[PDB]
């Protein structure tokens, strides 16, 4: 059978180091990786964030949980598929490690952010464009998988830990609603532009976690040019086809420039003020805007 065999492969595979897998890099791709390789990357993320050891996760249970999440993504359009969710999680790991946000967060927050990044597009006919203000995410399928026999990666948590973790997971998944990002970001941007931003209070914490989910969710926009151009083209094709191709391709530069200006640039600027080591996300976003703008101008002939 398909199910049992995937598990055996994964559980008995050597998990290469973070270094070897390049998951600490903001520039990380995934294009060339197999699903099994992404699963090994995911085990490494849980491991190097100390989640497996601090919460007593059983190896085979973690493997089964990863494989159940991937399986439940099967019917999704490609831009809300397992690879997107995996990329969102890798950006979170990179932001925690290279971007040094790990020191600013608790173990429960880190655990929930990783699980949310991985689960946020599990939603259970025309589909909305990627990151539309009209999308609304749900946590129901994430929780169902977490509570499923053999998949209970939170079994090691005390009841109080468990209830708090679920609350943060729900908030973090709901944070990927772009409408909620747009609604709340003004308060974030104002606290920072002044210098009043403070991780101390429950509220400014929840808000920072939400801005970080958004920053990871949109992070294809920060990638080196050949990766961003590729993703954007694929994403566009996935929506527009759900002189034909010319009409499609000619829209894309102005789409991306508009999205960077309205949504992305200010967020990665704000993130960089919280942690200067998240600078490469901003830099990459700025370089892609330059590249798409030159294409928008050259397409006007
Ligand atoms: Zn997403």
UniProtKB/Swiss-Prot annotation:
Composed of a C-terminal catalytic domain containing two putative divalent metal sites and an N-terminal regulatory domain which contains two homologous allosteric cGMP-binding regions, A and B. Phosphorylation is regulated by binding of cGMP to the two allosteric sites. Phosphorylation by PRKG1 leads to its activation. 3',5'-cyclic GMP binds at residue 256. This is cGMP-specific 3',5'-cyclic phosphodiesterase. It comes from the Eukaryota. The chain holds residues 534 to 862 of 875 of the full protein. Expressed in aortic smooth muscle cells, heart, placenta, skeletal muscle and pancreas and, to a much lesser extent, in brain, liver and lung. The active site is at residue 80. Belongs to the cyclic nucleotide phosphodiesterase family. Zn(2+) binds at residues 84, 120-121, 217. Changing residue 228 to Y: Changes substrate selectivity from cGMP-specific to dual cAMP and cGMP binding and hydrolysis. Mg(2+) binds at residue 121. Plays a role in signal transduction by regulating the intracellular concentration of cyclic nucleotides. This phosphodiesterase catalyzes the specific hydrolysis of cGMP to 5'-GMP. Specifically regulates nitric-oxide-generated cGMP. Residues 3-299 form the PDEase domain.
């Amino acid at each position: 059978e398909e199910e049992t065999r995937e598990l055996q492969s994964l559980a008995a595979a050597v998990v290469p180091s973070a270094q070897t897998l390049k998951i600490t890099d903001f520039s990380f791709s995934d294009f060339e990786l197999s699903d099994l390789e992404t699963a090994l990357c995911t085990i490494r993320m849980f491991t190097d964030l100390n989640l497996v050891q601090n919460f007593q996760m059983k190896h085979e249970v973690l493997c089964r949980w990863i494989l159940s999440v991937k399986k439940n993504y099967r019917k999704n359009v490609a831009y809300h598929n397992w690879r997107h969710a995996f990329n969102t999680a890798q950006c979170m790991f990179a932001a925690l490690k290279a971007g040094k946000i790990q020191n600013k967060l608790t173990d429960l927050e880190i655990l929930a952010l990783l699980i949310a990044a991985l689960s946020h597009d599990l939603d259970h006919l025309a589909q909305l464009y990627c990151h539309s203000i009209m999308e609304h995410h749900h946590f129901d399928q994430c929780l169902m998988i977490l509570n499923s026999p053999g998949n209970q990666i939170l079994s090691g948590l005390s009841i109080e830990e468990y209830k708090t973790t679920l609350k943060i997971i729900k908030q973090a998944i709901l944070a990927t609603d772009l409408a909620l990002y747009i609604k709340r970001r003004g308060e974030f941007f104002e606290l920072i532009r002044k210098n009043q931003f403070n991780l101390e209070d429950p509220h400014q914490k929840e808000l920072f976690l939400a801005m970080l989910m958004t920053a990871c969710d949109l992070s294809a926009i920060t990638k080196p040019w050949p990766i961003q151009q590729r993703i954007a083209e694929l994403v566009a094709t996935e929506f527009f086809d759900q002189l034909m191709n010319r009409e499609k391709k000619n829209k894309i530069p102005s789409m991306q420039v508009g999205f960077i200006d309205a949504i992305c640039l200010q967020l990665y600027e704000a993130l960089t003020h919280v942690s200067e080591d998240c600078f490469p996300l901003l830099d990459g976003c700025r370089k892609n805007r330059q590249k798409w703008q030159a294409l928008a101008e050259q397409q006007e002939k």
